[PDB]
Amino acid sequence: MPSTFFNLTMAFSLSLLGTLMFRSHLMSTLLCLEGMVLSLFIMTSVTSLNSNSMSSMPIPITILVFAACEAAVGLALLVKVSNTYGTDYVQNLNLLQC
Amino acid sequence: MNPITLAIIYFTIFLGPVITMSSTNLMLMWVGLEFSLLAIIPMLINKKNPRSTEAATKYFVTQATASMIILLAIVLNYKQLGTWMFQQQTNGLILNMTLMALSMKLGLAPFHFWLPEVTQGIPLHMGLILLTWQKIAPLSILIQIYPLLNSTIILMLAITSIFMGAWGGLNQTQMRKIMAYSSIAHMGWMLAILPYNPSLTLLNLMIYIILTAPMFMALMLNNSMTINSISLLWNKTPAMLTMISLMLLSLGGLPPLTGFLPKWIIITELMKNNCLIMATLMAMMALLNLFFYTRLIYSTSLTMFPTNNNSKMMTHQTKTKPNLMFSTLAIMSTMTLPLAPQLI
Amino acid sequence: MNNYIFVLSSLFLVGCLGLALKPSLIYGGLGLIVSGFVGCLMVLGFGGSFLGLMVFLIYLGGMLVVFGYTTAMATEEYPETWGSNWLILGFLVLGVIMEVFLICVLNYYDEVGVINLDGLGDWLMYEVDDVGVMLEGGIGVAAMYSCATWMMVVAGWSLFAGIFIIIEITR
Amino acid sequence: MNLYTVIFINILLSLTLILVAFWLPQLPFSMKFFLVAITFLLFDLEIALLLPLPWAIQTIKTSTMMIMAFILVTILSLGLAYEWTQKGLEWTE
Amino acid sequence: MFFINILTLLVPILIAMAFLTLVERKILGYMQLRKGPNIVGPYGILQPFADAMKLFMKEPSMSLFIIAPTLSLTLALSLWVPLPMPHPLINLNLGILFILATSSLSVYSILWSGWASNSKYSLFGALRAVAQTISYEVTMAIILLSVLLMNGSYSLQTLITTQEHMWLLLPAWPMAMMWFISTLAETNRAPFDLTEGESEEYAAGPFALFFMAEYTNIILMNALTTIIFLGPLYYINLPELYSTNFMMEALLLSSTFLWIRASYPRFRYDQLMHLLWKNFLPLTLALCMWHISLPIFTAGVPPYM
Amino acid sequence: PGIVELPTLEELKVEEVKVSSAVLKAAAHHYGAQCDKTNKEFMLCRWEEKDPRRCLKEGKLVNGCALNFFRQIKSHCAEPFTEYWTCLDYSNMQLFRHCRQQQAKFDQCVLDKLGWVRPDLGQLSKVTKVKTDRPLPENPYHSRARPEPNPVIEGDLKPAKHGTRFFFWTV
Amino acid sequence: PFLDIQKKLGISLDRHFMFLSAEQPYKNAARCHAFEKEWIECAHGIGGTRAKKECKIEFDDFEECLLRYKTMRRMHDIKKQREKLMKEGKYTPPPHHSGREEPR
Amino acid sequence: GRISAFLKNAWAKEPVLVVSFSVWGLAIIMPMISPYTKYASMINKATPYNYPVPVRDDGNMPDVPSHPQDPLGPSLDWLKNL
Amino acid sequence: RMMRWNQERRRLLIEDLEARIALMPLFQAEKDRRTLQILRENLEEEAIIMKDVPNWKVGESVFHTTRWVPPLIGEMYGLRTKEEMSNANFGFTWYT
């Protein structure tokens, strides 16, 4: 348990780095967000089923649904961006600095 | 945005914080945070212009990272103890992460370089909410967990916000960005006092709100979002000045007004608790906020700038937007210092 | 088949690492699908059959599908492939070497904490109701319909609002 | 072990077939699609919420499960009908 | 032992898929008033092997190129594992959910093929077919979520002991009229085979694999119907009899598919998505609520061993 | 910190039943009443005291009773009981549906030769008190004293003194 | 908490499973039920700083029940020493540990 | 009259919605009507997925029985008489 | 007919669960004696295994409770072979 748990936390940290550093795209960031969410759901269900607790299981479902909707609105925004500029790049957002 | 959608989104926005607070479960708190985030994004992006979309992307990304971090904190606490709530027996790294996230979610520094851009891309009637009904739940979370915090980094963060917000406000002309920097500084004051007495953060927040909301009403009036576009107030509507000047001096925190009282009793607490050095820094660097409020007072009232002819065609008209609560809050801000004890 | 969970864990690590070393999205989505697969298998090995299958049915079938959908219909892998994948592959190799040696270092200082290697197989299940029916995560997830109704109504409202939000956005 | 055996067997059989195949011889956007994918999500999430009935039903608070089911279904249908009326299911551009 | 059983489960089903291609050709010919293949061998029992040899003889990103068909075929074959006939190879509670997952996945292959082929022409149809498949799998899942409340367990064995007395069609036929249709979409069969109707990239080998998996899924969905809504006779002394009746009904459904393919025209994409979103989803929700209430305003609330 | 007590292998060595699950599941019903006092008393001991190392003398009695029960069932009516479990174990889940007309025969034999009567439906899922001779303990958790609450402050709630005591804001 | 609307209405929506030993559905008690039931009873009636120092004898045991760091280490040292002995050539594991026995 | 005309129209124009709404109404309404509803909760309470831990007799409680097969306890005969 | 059949199925379920009820006590006692013997053997071996070290104890309850403690499969089968440890962990989870 402890080994796999530390490794899952490492994976969360790696998705954190992926989101906090870019490579000229946005879908990569959102996918790293999804990776975070997956690691979290897994760690929570693991904790629950290891403690044999049951009433605490609805939480993974809840946060998974919320991550689904969150990524959905993020994709909608990405799409509006691509359809108003011409692509989903990141260096096009040089505005608002004035 | 048709009425059903408008109503549902306003409901979810009025809900997110209510749940985040009335709930004793960190998962429900995080949920309310996500509610605010989601239900707000549209109101930012309604005009569907490129600037609005860009601001929406920035806002969403930062707040997403923040929410996921807070979730990591909660889950680690679960593995550690079993309860879904924070206790006095949690490895301080978890609290530090929670604090970084709450900060990035508020606008504190150095997690603050996304607030001015967004608040410039936004209109007024949504920047107002962004500044005055999204910084509440993230603060209730702290109100719940103030004892066991890390005063060191809390204070470093607060004072960093003070400095950076003031230094940016010295320059920014765009009134939206100015208001944003002022928000940064006042939230710095709050976080500075927080782990000693929370009611004082509550007070600083309510006061900053009562000063901000009416300013944004006076702006919504004309959509004048610039110094050279607000200086013309003495020819468009010469009435709002006798109150705007007062409210800006207040936001600065001049004694006879009310905006002073918060800083005053806050310094009192920090002196009781022997933090006089950082108290001195805060008190000697609020003066730049006072400065770039005075510099707008100048532009608007104390001196009259060149107007534009078509303002005559305007004056021939009339205007009945400015509701009663504007004046009510302006007064109950400026002229209520005698009632500080009844406020504590 | 004792190293099972450690292996699945390392593979999830590597999937998230291949997503953090942002590659071309077409060769990052495969890493994500692998990540989800392996994480579900870990959950299953622990005993959350319902949770694992829920993942297979929703995460992959529901979210990765639409991710690829949107990506294709709204993205172009411009020629940014100046051997970028072939570079980050060796970079990933170096990182995985770093991690292997990092764990082989840790195991010395920490023995019964971070990881117990000599007895790795142990310490997955701690207790269990041998003679007990009704002990699967199905019951915990069904809770929402008798107790904890707040979860269900909140998710319902999240969707009830996400519909309006998405549509009002796209226009 | 059993599912591992079966899956490895199936994969290896398919790869034998493909290796035989290889040896024997010697764009703008359409908002409608994204909206449809979004509907699919917001329904899969309902499915995740709704599957556990075969165990939520054997409890004692029938007056609660019956209700919550009706609630989910009806509010989802309301959102669907609103999407329809606001023309998310017409396909004419 | 186990390898023997997996062989018994994999070889005969490929044989049956080949001879099912044959049966399709023959029945379509006999409905169009012609014979069909009667030459290559006695009554046409060698045309399939002929096609196999020919395809593997035909000349032609390797990653996608291979993983897509391989993935699809492996999923289609694994789908068979958990079925009861009458005692299954792998008894899994949540077996039908495993089925649904492994049936939905192949969309990844459909989509990778497009994202590889730069042809806007190809992405067009890829998106269209992916969307229709998704939308119909939704209801394919809700139907089970609304029926299985009759047996409070996602297993596939309990279906049999349930149907011991009666079938599952006399009730729930408002669903069977659907589960016998969505199966014509996930399979991209008629009258929803537009994905092969409007053409303007599958080589010989990968085409063979795609078609293998297609007809495998045909057989398998028909078997699922024969198990769910057409409960066989489980007299424990006669597993042979169970398997036999199952065979019969599976063949019947697999010939009904062909009646259809011959008789009807194809659906225009927009008309099809209209069909779903405005005829099946409201009915589906309401019928699910109906079958949720039934075990409450009736004692018929089932058990969970 | 602190030693643990334990019994010894050389003791608590009783000759177990070693009979199969099918036979147990078949004969249970009668054994539900026959040999019920002992089993109920044992479950009560185990639920009151969480010390299996203290609830042992009530296990050898249980096994002895079960054996003196299977002994009567061996003496009388053995073949009906053998064909019975050979009919049960054939199935997978060992259900009582596929053996009905091989059950009432055995039942009538057991009756016509003994004063047993197969319990009715819902006769064992009922709490039945059990008269014993040993006492009930307290502090079974071996807990510790509860540290004293905070001494409460009280007295009539009269007003402030000299005002808010704030800076010259008397009233 | 912050806004005690729940306590005012005398109701509960989330706070009935805020921790481990709440009422689980089919009476299936969790792992460290007893240790939780004692930690809470010592941390009731008093607030915070009292408990953070006068409940350690009841909370360390709980954290161990929950994680068992010390038991992990105990078993680890045991097995390490046993391996070293079987290397040097002094041990000889008996059957009950070495692969068979006369079980129940 | 307007209602009758509207339904006489819908029953040819768009019946699907009529069927759906009628089913919805039937589902929401019948549970409040039928007499065989409470029996479900009674059953699922009777079903013993756990063990019925017994109690002592240091008092004069006459309700609980000293034996399972005795009649002094809560009965459910209506189950088989159903 | 579905109703009249589901009710009979519930009755059969009650029968099976009553059987399990009647048999639980016996099984509980067997399991208890078995785990106690297991721990006694772990102890009789631990003695000789770790007698040659300094300031080491024998069956030292890591708690300060005196309360009985459900032992972990780790403790019990920690000295037996991977065979048994896995036949314990992944027994129900690897399809019989």
UniProtKB/Swiss-Prot annotation, chain A:
| Record gene name | Mtnd4l
Just give the chief location class: mitochondrion
The entry's protein name is NADH-ubiquinone oxidoreductase chain 4L
Q: Could you give one GO CC term from the UniProt record?
A: mitochondrion
In Gene Ontology terms, what is a biological process of this protein? ATP synthesis coupled electron transport
Class in the EC hierarchy, top level: translocase
Protein EC: 7.1.1.2
Q: Which UniProt keywords apply?
A: Electron transport, Membrane, Mitochondrion, Mitochondrion inner membrane, NAD, Respiratory chain, Translocase, Transmembrane, Transmembrane helix, Transport, Ubiquinone
Question: Which residue ranges run through the membrane?
Answer: 2-22, 26-46, 58-79
Mention one GO molecular function. NADH dehydrogenase (ubiquinone) activity
> Quaternary form?
Core subunit of respiratory chain NADH dehydrogenase (Complex I) which is composed of 45 different subunits.
Fetch the Pfam families from UniProt.
Oxidored_q2 (PF00420)
Taxonomically, the superkingdom here is Eukaryota
Q: What is the organism field in this record?
A: Mus musculus
Bilayer topology reads: Multi-pass membrane protein
Localization recorded for this chain is:
Mitochondrion inner membrane
Curated annotation (Swiss-Prot), chain F:
Residue numbers covered by motif Cx9C motif 1: 35-45
User: How is this protein positioned relative to the membrane?
Assistant: Peripheral membrane protein
The processes (GO biological process) annotated in the record are: aerobic respiration; mitochondrial electron transport, NADH to ubiquinone; proton motive force-driven mitochondrial ATP synthesis
**Which PANTHER family does this chain map to?**
NADH DEHYDROGENASE [UBIQUINONE] 1 ALPHA SUBCOMPLEX SUBUNIT 8, NADH-UBIQUINONE OXIDOREDUCTASE
Disulfide bonds listed in the record: C35-C65, C45-C55, C77-C109, C87-C99
Q: What is known of its domains?
A: Contains four C-X9-C motifs that are predicted to form a helix-coil-helix structure, permitting the formation of intramolecular disulfide bonds.
Q: Cross-referenced InterPro entries, in alphabetical order?
A: CHCH, NDUFA8
Sequence motif: Cx9C motif 4, positions: 99-109
Keyword terms: Disulfide bond, Electron transport, Membrane, Mitochondrion, Mitochondrion inner membrane, Repeat, Respiratory chain, Transport
Annotated Pfam families = CHCH
| Positions occupied by motif Cx9C motif 3 | 77-87
Q: Where in the cell is it found?
A: Mitochondrion inner membrane; Mitochondrion intermembrane space; Mitochondrion
For the motif Cx9C motif 2, what are the positions?
55-65
* Protein role: Accessory subunit of the mitochondrial membrane respiratory chain NADH dehydrogenase (Complex I), that is believed not to be involved in catalysis. Complex I functions in the transfer of electrons from NADH to the respiratory chain. The immediate electron acceptor for the enzyme is believed to be ubiquinone.
| Name recorded for this polypeptide | NADH dehydrogenase [ubiquinone] 1 alpha subcomplex subunit 8
Query: How does the annotation summarize its subunit structure?
Result: Complex I is composed of 45 different subunits.
Q: Which family does it belong to?
A: Belongs to the complex I NDUFA8 subunit family.
Swiss-Prot record, chain G:
Subunit record text = Mammalian complex I is composed of 45 different subunits. This is a component of the iron-sulfur (IP) fragment of the enzyme.
Name its species.
Answer: Mus musculus
Short motif Cx9C motif 1, span: 32-42
| One Gene Ontology term, aspect cellular component | mitochondrion
Major site of localization recorded for this protein = mitochondrion
Q: What does this protein do?
A: Accessory subunit of the mitochondrial membrane respiratory chain NADH dehydrogenase (Complex I), that is believed not to be involved in catalysis. Complex I functions in the transfer of electrons from NADH to the respiratory chain. The immediate electron acceptor for the enzyme is believed to be ubiquinone.
**What PANTHER family does the entry give?**
NADH DEHYDROGENASE [UBIQUINONE] IRON-SULFUR PROTEIN 5
Q: What is known of its domains?
A: Contains two C-X9-C motifs that are predicted to form a helix-coil-helix structure, permitting the formation of intramolecular disulfide bonds.
Q: Where is this motif: Cx9C motif 2?
A: 55-65
Q: How does it sit in the membrane?
A: Peripheral membrane protein
Q: Where in the cell is it found?
A: Mitochondrion inner membrane; Mitochondrion intermembrane space
Which cysteines are disulphide-bonded? C32-C65, C42-C55
The CHCH domain extends over 29-73
Q: What family does the Swiss-Prot or TrEMBL record give for this protein?
A: Belongs to the complex I NDUFS5 subunit family.
Renumbered to this chain, region (Disordered) spans 78-104
Alphabetical GO biological process terms: aerobic respiration; mitochondrial respiratory chain complex I assembly; proton motive force-driven mitochondrial ATP synthesis
**Keywords per UniProt:** Disulfide bond, Electron transport, Membrane, Mitochondrion, Mitochondrion inner membrane, Respiratory chain, Transport
Could you tell me what this protein is called? Answer: NADH dehydrogenase [ubiquinone] iron-sulfur protein 5
InterPro entries attached to this UniProt entry: NADH_UbQ_OxRdtase_FeS-su5 (IPR019342)
- Biased composition range(s): Basic and acidic residues: 78-90
From Swiss-Prot, chain H:
Q: What keywords were assigned to this record?
A: Acetylation, Electron transport, Membrane, Mitochondrion, Mitochondrion inner membrane, Respiratory chain, Transmembrane, Transmembrane helix, Transport
Chief subcellular site? mitochondrion
The UniProt annotation puts the region (Disordered) at 57-82
Look up keyword Mitochondrion and say if it applies.
yes
The entry's function note states: Accessory subunit of the mitochondrial membrane respiratory chain NADH dehydrogenase (Complex I), that is believed not to be involved in catalysis. Complex I functions in the transfer of electrons from NADH to the respiratory chain. The immediate electron acceptor for the enzyme is believed to be ubiquinone.
Q: Which family does it belong to?
A: Belongs to the complex I NDUFA3 subunit family.
Q: What is this protein called?
A: NADH dehydrogenase [ubiquinone] 1 alpha subcomplex subunit 3
From which source organism is this entry? Mus musculus
